[PDB]
Amino acid sequence: RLFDKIRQVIRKF
């Protein structure tokens, strides 16, 4: 969901 995107970023931070 809209979070699937909030997860990717974590990869960056």
Q: DSSP secondary structure string, 1-13?
A: -TTHHHHHHHHH-
Tokens representing residue 11 in the block: 């990869």
Eight-state DSSP code of residue 2: T
Length of the chain: 13
**Residue position matching structure tokens 């990717």:** 8
Q: CA-to-CA distance for 7 and 13, rounded, in angstroms? A: 9
Q: CA-to-CA distance for 5 and 11, rounded, in angstroms? A: 10
**Residue position matching structure tokens 């970023």:** 9
Dump strand ranges (E) for 1-13: none
Q: What angle do CA 8, 12, 13 make, to 5 degrees?
A: 100
Q: What angle do CA 1, 13, 3 make, to 5 degrees?
A: 5
Eight-state DSSP code of residue 5: H
